[PDB]
Amino acid sequence: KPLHYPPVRRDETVVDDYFGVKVADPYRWLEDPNSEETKEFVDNQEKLANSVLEECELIDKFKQKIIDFVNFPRCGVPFRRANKYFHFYNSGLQAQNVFQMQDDLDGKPEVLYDPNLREGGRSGLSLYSVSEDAKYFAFGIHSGLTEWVTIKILKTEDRSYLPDTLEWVKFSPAIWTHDNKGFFYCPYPPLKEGEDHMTRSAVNQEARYHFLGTDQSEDILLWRDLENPAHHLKCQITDDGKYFLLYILDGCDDANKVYCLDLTKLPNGLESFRDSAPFMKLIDSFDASYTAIANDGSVFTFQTNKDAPRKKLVRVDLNNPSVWTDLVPESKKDLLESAHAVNENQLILRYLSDVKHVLEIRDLESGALQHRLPIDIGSVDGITARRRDSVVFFKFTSILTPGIVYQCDLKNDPTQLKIFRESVVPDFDRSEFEVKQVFVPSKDGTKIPIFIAARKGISLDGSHPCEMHGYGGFGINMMPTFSASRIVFLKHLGGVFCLANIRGGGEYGEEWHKAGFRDKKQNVFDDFISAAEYLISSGYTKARRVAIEGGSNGGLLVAACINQRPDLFGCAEANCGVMDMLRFHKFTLGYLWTGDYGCSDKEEEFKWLIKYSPIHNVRRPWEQPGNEETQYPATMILTADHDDRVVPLHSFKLLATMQHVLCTSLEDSPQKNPIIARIQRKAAHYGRATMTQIAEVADRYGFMAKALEAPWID
Amino acid sequence: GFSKPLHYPPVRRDETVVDDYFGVKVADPYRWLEDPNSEETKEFVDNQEKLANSVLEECELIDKFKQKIIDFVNFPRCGVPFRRANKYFHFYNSGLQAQNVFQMQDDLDGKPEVLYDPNLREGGRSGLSLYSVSEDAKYFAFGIHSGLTEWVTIKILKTEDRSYLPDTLEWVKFSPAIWTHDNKGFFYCPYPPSAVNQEARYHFLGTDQSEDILLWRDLENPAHHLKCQITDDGKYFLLYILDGCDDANKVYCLDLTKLPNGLESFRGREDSAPFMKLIDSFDASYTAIANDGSVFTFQTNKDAPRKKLVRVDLNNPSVWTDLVPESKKDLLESAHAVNENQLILRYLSDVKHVLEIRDLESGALQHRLPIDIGSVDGITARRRDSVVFFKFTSILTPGIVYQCDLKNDPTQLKIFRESVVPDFDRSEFEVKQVFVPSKDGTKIPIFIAARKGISLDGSHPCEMHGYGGFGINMMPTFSASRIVFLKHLGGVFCLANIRGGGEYGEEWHKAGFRDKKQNVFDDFISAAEYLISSGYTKARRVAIEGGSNGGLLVAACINQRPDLFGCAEANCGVMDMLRFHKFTLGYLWTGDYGCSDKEEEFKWLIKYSPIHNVRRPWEQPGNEETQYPATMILTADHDDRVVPLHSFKLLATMQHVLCTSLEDSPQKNPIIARIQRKARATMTQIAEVADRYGFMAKALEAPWID
Ligand SMILES: C[As](C)(=O)[O-]
Ligand SMILES: C[As](C)(=O)[O-]
DSSP states (O other), X not given: OOOOOOOOOOOTTOEEEETTEEEEOTTGGGGOTTSHHHHHHHHHHHHHHHHHHHHOTTHHHHHHHHHHHHOSOEEOOOEEETTEEEEEEEOSSOSSOEEEEEETTTSOOEEEEOGGGSGGGSSOOSOEEEOTTSOEEEEEEOSSSSXXXXXXXXXXXXXXXXXXXXXEESSOOOEEOTTSSEEEEOOOOOOOTTOOTXXXXXXXXXXXXXXXXXOGGGOEEEEOOTTSTTOEEEEEEXXXXXXXXXXXXXXXXXXXEEEEEESTTOTTSGGGOOOOOOOEEEEOSSSSOEEEEEEETTEEEEEEOTTOTTOEEEEEETTEEEEEEEEEOOOSSSEEEEEEEETTTEEEEEEEETXXXXXXXXETTTOOEEXXXXXXXXXXXXXXXXXXXXXXXXXXXXTTEEEEEEEEETTTSTTOOEEEEEOOOSSOOGGGEEEEEEEEEOTTSOEEEEEEEXXXXXXXXXXXXXXXXXXOOTTOOOOOOOOHHHHHHHHHSOOEEEEEOOBTBSTTOHHHHHTTSGGGTHHHHHHHHHHHHHHHHHTSOOGGGEEEEEETHHHHHHHHHHHHOGGGOSEEEEESOOOOTTTGGGSTTGGGGHHHHOOTTSHHHHHHHHHHOGGGOOOOGGGSTTOTTOOOOEEEEEEETTOSSSOTHHHHHHHHHHIIIIIITXXXXXXXXXXXXXXXXXXXXXXXXXXXXXXXXXXXXXXXXXXXXXXOOO | OOOSOOOOOXXXXXXXXXXXXXXXXXXXXXXXGGOTTXXXXXXXXXXXXXXXXXXXXXXXXXXXXXXXXXXXXXXXEEOOOEXXXXXXXXXXXXXXXXXXXXXXXXXXXXXXXXXXXXXXSGGGSSOOSXXXXXXXXXXXXXXXXXXXXXXXXXXXXXXXXXXXXXXXXXXXXXXXXXXXXXXXXXXXXXXXXXXXXXXXXXXXXXXOGGGOEEEEOOTTSTTOEEEEEEXXXXXXXXXXXXXXXXXXXXXXXXXXXXXXXXXXXXXSOOOSOOOEEXXXXXXXXXXXXXXXXXXXXXXXXXXXXXXXXXXXXXXXXXXXXXXXOOOSSOEEEEEEEETTTEEEEEEXXXXXXXXXXXXXXXXXXXXXXXXXXXXXXXXXXOXXXXXXXXXXXXXXXXXXXXXXXXXXXXXXXXXXXXXXXXXXXXXXXXXXXXXXXXXXSOEEEEEEXXXXXXXXXXXXXXXXXXXXXXXXXXXXXXXXXXXXXXXXSXXXXXXXXXTTXXXXXXXXXXXXXGGGTHHHHHHHHHHHHHHHHHTSOOGGGEEEEEETHHHHHHHHHHHHOGGGOSEEEEESOOOOTTTGGGSTTGGGGHHHHOOTTSHHHXXXXXXXXXXXXXXXXXXXXXXXXXXXXXXXXXXXXXXXXSOTHHHHHHHHHHIIIIIIXXXXXXXXXXXXXXXXXXXXXXXXXXXXXXXHHHHHHHHTTOOOOO
């Protein structure tokens, strides 16, 4: 059916000079989220979207089949405080997960906090910190539509609220001191009047200590740096309770400083401060990443990438800090992803080996190997066991494995794994499908690992719809994990799924990351294109039956790839993508990503950014000689109206630009395939209700089945 | 409402089939549809499913209804707890679980744990039918539907560790499991290894069903059916015998203390046990409420349409005394012995509940809590219990489980659990009661729910519900669907308490049954006329809905007054009144309908029988512009309760008479069937109600409001 693309005003005033190169930005006005015109733009694109989505008949069958496939209990990985175990639970279709509590392992669960009983379950919990004595539960809620968090505190004895209320938190955890008196957290300064969380670029993050029973204005300032407003914070406390550790970060880089405060050495408590705090600055530069794993007095075991792309464990005494020793040296082939001190004197290491996990248990003091459990295609994650804990829990998942919380009692039954909880998916035969790993040459010959999931014994004749996922940035490892949606794609649309472990990720250590960032960011798109070409050439699928999907930096990936190779894809779905690479740093926490992208402030970096910036590279493919029959694929640009993480102007400005260049700028365009935006109302980036999510994925796959001309199978 | 033209599928007519009802010839050309398992009947089901799906695709609002119902229903719901030993047991549902989970806890303060989760068995297609916890709280007997039929299989669980006993008891329908105080076993009432010759059995734990002791059966009266009970002191097994659907029963008492050995006393045959037959006729209803030795307190309707409590000693059984005598205006609906020496009575007073606490021995009134527009239900407290629980609900009140500690703080009510519905402002709506004159002048109570301060200008869609039979009281209770109708379709709801029900006792029942069954339809029509004349709605913005006997109500009313309605939705209706008694348990309903076996009864049945009164309204001389309303006939493909031939034969007959029998019919409004396959689960229900209201919004031309 023909589309009626709504009028979007162009402003030819807006020209900007990037080192002599003139760049026109006619949809500058869309950067204002709260204007008459921008709200009418959102309204118009919602109408256009709803008109196209009404023609996608399969949305309703997807939605009902997702709802059924997802209606099973899901369990979070439990953690211990005192004799209490706490975990997240969801019976299957509850809008938000419920936080549960129990006395010891045998104990029966009870509800500690149910977000479904507050504001109808629109917001779930972001922060969830139980104190050392298990008497206090600090928890974070989204008080507005943005993802900014309000810390509140509860007595676990009887669910009664404390008066304490702490605003202006984002990703900070609440780190309790062993005296149960309060906790360290890392807030931003308050909003002055006029300001908004969508329009303010939050800087000058602080390290605070909050005492229980006080107003936030009484919280003790430990650190801040007004001379470096972009520097951001993470923090931690050692398991013995003696050291507060402050990690300072430059941007999105896997690198940090390490500042240690000895809590035993302060006369008059943390009330001592009122003057910044006497940190021992063990690392005062951004050369390498460092994460404390354990300590015995001043003798610290860190995970690091210092002269070690695949990471390693090292030891240092804060009284003799120039002398560092390798405890567990760098592997020659496999990434040390995480390390966790457990069972007093043991050490669990998670290794990533060709995108498959291997768990090692080692002696803490010596570093000697004891056991080694390789794990199947899938992921192991969520190890939250502390050093004093003797039972270790982890979540396992894969493409065909819904989710198993495993349990290892290292003290009393060390070799066995017990299933704490196993989620079973209804109406799904896993043996009918298989998952293979395959390595594919890229444009420069680099072998890129690919996971391909499909029905066993499909003929490779290019008949099948193919859905391909990828990210390619920020050191993120992309693991094959369970999505119920995807099972519905595989089973009821005869689909083939592909997770491509492209460069920019951290799958083969920091060399893999740096091969797809800054000047070499193009390699990431080349890798993804090359993997799409393999699925076609090996015979799973064809040019116009391939669908690509991604979120945030993955949205950038999808937008970049369809600009460069529109012929290769039949559907493009970019979730909250970073589409204006010239101006991303100007909005919210976007300045943090300059470590991976560069910044248009510098001329060298502008020169590589301008070449792939999605909004600046939308070109009519049919106008290229010998490319006449090519058009852009059917495109859905997903975003929320109140995403403060990746601001929606990115998605809006791309959508406006595409709809102009391809459709409304000429009389009768070859562009037939729809170019729409699904804009979710009163949502943020993540943390949305179960049905809000299901509705979005239902629309995704319905649009996809229409674009790829894929029929339903009962 | 519906613009795109329909293609009604061919349905073969058989002019062989003529039947002689006392000289009056009656043709039944869709006789063949009575066979559910034929080539032709299965193709009929397939064709009407195509027609249905084609019409429903045009109903754009179905999807918005479905998502809004799902959201409005996704809140925790709690059932009324009951106590055994120090344990409390209740049904729970987090909101969209396919079936309710049975929970358990140690005392009132205690934290719930799951005792049985049906969602982990058979994917939650079947929930629990029976749920009997033993006296010591160690054993949980529970009923499942093993297959699509309504037959139940009793299974038994140890509550200590969830382990199953080997015991498996087939061939149960509605029977409960009544445990003896020795915890050794239980009385239940199965059918033999059709459904006639029901038996009263005792089952010992750890035995096969074939070893169960026979207490009673009557091969000379195969249609007589059974309920049973045990007294709170554990001493008396009571067997109630029933004639049909009528509110009357016998009362047989067995003294359990007088048996040498246990119930092994009857080990071998000795068919029938030595019951004291306190009532051996079907004159009145009797339900034991309490006893002190052989001195029994019964609820009854003996010379008492609105019911009363009476006392009798089994050693002096000819002497009956009124304990709480019949009220002159209000029905005694149920009575429960509580707190050792107290007695809680539920009265229905102009379709509103009034709870009275009285002294057991004397019958003296102590407290009296009238309750708001709504219902109170599920009082399961025993005599030895000091805390009483009940569930409250209304049109705008999702569900409150109340708690009354009669020992300490007897007058105050605590909220055990209150379900809160999301995205719903209750204060924006109101519910009024109004009494409306019927065709014979009788004042019929009506509940009307709507937005506060609507103008009465006939603009609003109106949905009207009713039943009218079998002594059933129709109470305004919570439906989340209905809130979506009121809020997002600007609707007006009406529950009409028509005759045939029991709302004003047995006089109300008998005024709408047999020869007087027409009064029920007249009452419903009269209430529809009031909503139009008072200005809530108009002729073609009124929708009527009902199930089973309520389906009969809807089909009867649209035949008689098609001009008055814009949408008709009849769920599992009884549509062939000449032949209903021939199928499954349909013979039971002859008490309320009559039977075409007898000539007087045929004469009133033929006048309203839905299948035999489908007439082209436009052919009537004043009535040219009238057509039948948009009609959805709801049914399941293997409903054994109200067999689907009723719905199929009506649908066939309507589609012929109104549409396919003439060149270019004035009948534009669609006449379809929504046939549910193999069915029940939360989503299956939500899908059905989504289709109901989507079709309705299309028929009534009602727009959506955000
Ligand atoms: C939120 As991002 C640009 O690190 O994927
Ligand atoms: C609900 As009925 C007694 O008409 O089957």
